[PDB]
Design a protein around this ligand. Structure first.
Ligand SMILES: Nc1ncnc2c1ncn2[C@@H]1O[C@H](COP(=O)(O)OP(=O)(O)O)[C@@H](O)[C@H]1O
Ligand SMILES: Nc1ncnc2c1ncn2[C@@H]1O[C@H](COP(=O)(O)OP(=O)(O)O)[C@@H](O)[C@H]1O
Lengths: 243, 291, 145, 97, 49, 49, 49
């Protein structure tokens, strides 16, 4: 059980949810049932790579003094006191009412105003991990939720890869260009995003590729759209629209 | 299930909503009081939607800012006041419900049982060519409907047009504004197709306002369905419509007589302050709007 | 023409009766017409046959619609002042409407020409048809065949 | 006598309080509750699982509710029927009947 | 016997239909005929659960 | 042979066409060659059922 | 490894821009993971070509 053992010493370090622990236990039982050389063994061993790779409980700690946020935003972005005061109130209020808290936010304006630049600057302010994810004009649901994992060439949605790359359980995801998302009859990803963005149902998100529920509750999502009007109402009504 | 009256949202939000969000931010009432006055200002101004979801976003925002004021901020007990409020939730966005107030001639209010809730969309019309193209000219004053028409809405429109043309010669023969001039007419989209024809009773009053050119009496919302001979027909979904008319400050309303039943099913507090005028034949409405 | 809608109604009445029994007051519900408006609410339809006096130029017409059959009315009216010129000699063009299919368009023109012929054959002094424009509206619902 | 199933529907402007009454009934009757959104769905397999000879097959969502909720008579709450995916690819809405 | 019997006492509480009774029991018989190592037996095992 | 034997008494009551008779016979033998645990044996088992 | 390595030898000859250096590197690492039989492998092999 070589791969099983490297992923299992992994399992011993990152604190997986016990539910996902037992679910990977039955799945590992199947992997024992599955053959050493089968092409499906390759699909499910690389499944084990995508699943074990995901941090499960790694928790980047934040700074919580407003001051260090003062500096680090000033280190990399001049002026714009309105947006800074907004982020300052954001940290100031989350810092008051105990634990970290979610909210979605958007910045919008002419391209190249520094939107993504402040995104990453905040990501290194809070110490959360960064990951861009453009969604302008996307249509297929295989890049957001993933495939079934029974399709040929199947791969998990983009999010599973961001978790695989960033190695923290509570990063600062940055979906990009939300306004122009492809909202079609072929399975609308923009509707599919609500499961991500639901404040309660993000905590037990699941996707067709890797069935096991994920727990995104600690993630601090961010989304970027050039104009607030085109975004469909159910998605647009939750999040605050900073300018 | 139906929508909710402006006052009704107050009794909801003070009990079933505020404490819940208070449990979302984890605070207790001891440090983050929110008076009734803040709530009435909120719902009256900043959120005009039949659902309660929008007010739920606002009160969330206020609470979480209070949490920031506690854990790090200055106050150990935030006390929102309306004068304070503009800090937390910013400056007011909407206030001037019902855009026109003088209602310049040829624009009339019209209720619409949209796909979600009800909204008091206006209907508007105007000339599109010089009127006196020929003092002897005999060309049909062709209409041009606009505003995301479904074809069914097109037949309804043509019917209402013809009834307007007949009503003028029945009333004031010397005028000939309608038959001798082109006219653009605009119905804002939003109504679901099945109720589509329900706007039609508004249409004819639009045209007539343009004809004599006198303004409609203020804030007299209406709805109906015209028959091509002045009979009016029942419309559907009345409860949503009446609440939408209530939000906009309407102080009169006109309905087909066939729905004198459903409107009275409504809870009595919902119906206070309106002054309904049921009618069946169209001529009636003409005397309850213009003169 | 079907029984489906009445099947819904009688269902509704019965289950409301069940609510009056299992906890309610009466041990034996007895529907009566005076009672009825309580249980099932206010009447829906009343004004069968929209027009009653039928002001000129509107006629009833049966139609074998896609489900059952329905008595849709047909309507018509002037579209311009008629005496645009006392000497004018221009065809009183018709304008058909109501989500017409093209086969109906040919039928319409045939019926129009027969009207024009019948008038001059009957009462020559009248000339309303050949000298004026006219809109005509056939409500949709008939199956194409 | 015995408990009985029945279908019911609620409809109105979004955010009127619908789902909240659902749960209030669930703790009223004391049946176990289980939400099940189906907005925008097209997976007939979700209503019926997969053959179990298909690779990766697991029974449809409902069976997961029976395994989790442990009652024979729970209160399923299908959500947002209006937006059910009615496509050429096998209409789930036919499968729900 | 271990898994089969914890599920069997399970089965003893809930009143399964005789149809489903014979199905679970014959599937249990196929568990007994199927070898423990087979991935086919892992599928039927997951199915039994 | 147990499964095939319940199948064959089954068939002993209902009178099959000789066409499908020979087909089930060759499938029965083809099953009999197949391993007691092979996935394809389960497929042909369910199929013969 | 043959396709990756002829891309590598030309990489020794032609100096790809450092952004193209990186991109071809991650795609090269992707090439070995994929099956030759996989459909996406064809489009991404031809893409790297
Ligand atoms: N106040 C600012 N401080 C630093 N850089 C800025 C500022 N305003 C604009 N920029 C620049 O604008 C560019 C835009 O980048 P970014 O926000 O990352 O993506 P986008 O093009 O979507 O806005 C960056 O190169 C950044 O340096
Ligand atoms: N009469 C009411 N009592 C309590 N809460 C209500 C009422 N009406 C609306 N709500 C609130 O509306 C919100 C959403 O209601 P629900 O129907 O459960 O979902 P949705 O309305 O989004 O479909 C809930 O957070 C709930 O507190």
């Amino acid at each position: 059980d070589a791969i099983e053992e490297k992923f299992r010493e992994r399992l011993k370090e990152l604190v997986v949810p016990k539910h996902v622990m037992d679910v990977v236990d039955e799945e590992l039982s199947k992997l024992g049932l599955l053959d050493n050389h089968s092409s499906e063994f390759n699909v499910t061993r690389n499944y084990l790579d995508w699943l074990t790779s995901i941090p499960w409980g790694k928790y980047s700690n934040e700074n919580l003094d407003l001051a260090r946020a003062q500096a680090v935003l000033e280190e990399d972005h001049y002026g714009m006191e309105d947006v800074k005061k907004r982020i300052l109130e954001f940290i100031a209020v989350s810092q008051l009412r105990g634990s970290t808290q979610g909210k979605i936010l958007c910045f919008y304006g002419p391209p190249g105003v520094g939107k993504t630049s402040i995104a990453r600057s905040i990501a290194r302010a809070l110490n959360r991990e960064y990951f861009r994810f453009s969604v302008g004009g996307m249509t297929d649901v295989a890049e957001i939720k993933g495939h079934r994992r029974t399709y040929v060439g199947a791969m998990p949605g983009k999010i599973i890869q961001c978790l695989k790359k960033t190695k923290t359980e509570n990063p600062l995801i940055l979906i990009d260009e939300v306004d122009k998302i492809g909202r079609g009859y072929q399975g609308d990803p923009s509707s599919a995003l609500l499961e991500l963005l639901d404040p309660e149902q993000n905590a037990n998100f699941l996707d067709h590729y890797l069935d096991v529920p994920v727990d995104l509750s600690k993630v601090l999502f961010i989304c970027t759209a050039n104009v607030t009007d085109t975004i469909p109402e159910p998605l647009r009504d939750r999040m605050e629209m900073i300018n | 299930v139906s929508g909710y009256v402006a006052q009704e949202k107050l009794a909801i939000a003070e009990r079933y909503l505020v404490p819940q969000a208070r449990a979302l931010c984890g605070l207790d009432e001891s440090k983050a009081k929110l008076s009734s006055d803040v709530l009435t200002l909120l719902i009256k101004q900043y959120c005009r939607e039949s659902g309660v979801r929008n007010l739920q976003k606002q009160v969330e925002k206020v609470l979480r800012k209070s949490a920031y004021k506690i854990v790090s901020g200055e106050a150990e007990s935030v006390e929102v006041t309306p004068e304070n409020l503009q800090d937390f939730v910013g400056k007011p966005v909407f206030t001037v419900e019902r855009m026109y107030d003088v209602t310049p001639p040829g624009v009339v209010m019209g209720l619409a049982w949209t796909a979600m809730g009800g909204s008091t969309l206006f209907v508007e019309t105007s000339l599109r060519r010089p009127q006196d193209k020929d003092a002897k000219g005999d060309k049909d004053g062709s209409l041009e409907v606009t505003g995301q028409l479904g074809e069914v809405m097109k037949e309804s429109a043509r019917i209402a047009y013809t009834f307007a043309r007949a009503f003028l010669m029945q009333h004031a023969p010397a005028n000939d504004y309608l038959v001798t001039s082109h006219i653009h007419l605009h119905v804002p989209e939003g109504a679901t197709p099945k109720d589509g024809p329900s706007a039609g009773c508004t249409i004819v009053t639009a045209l007539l306002s343009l004809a004599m050119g006198r303004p409609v009496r203020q804030n007299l919302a209406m709805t109906g369905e015209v028959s091509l001979t002045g009979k009016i027909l029942p419309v559907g979904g009345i409860k949503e419509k009446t609440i939408a008319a209530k939000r906009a400050g309407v102080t009169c309303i006109v309905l087909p007589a066939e729905n004198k039943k459903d409107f009275y099913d409504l809870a009595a507090f919902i119906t206070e302050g309106l002054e309904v005028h049921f009618v069946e034949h169209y001529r009636e409405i003409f005397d309850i709007a213009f003169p």
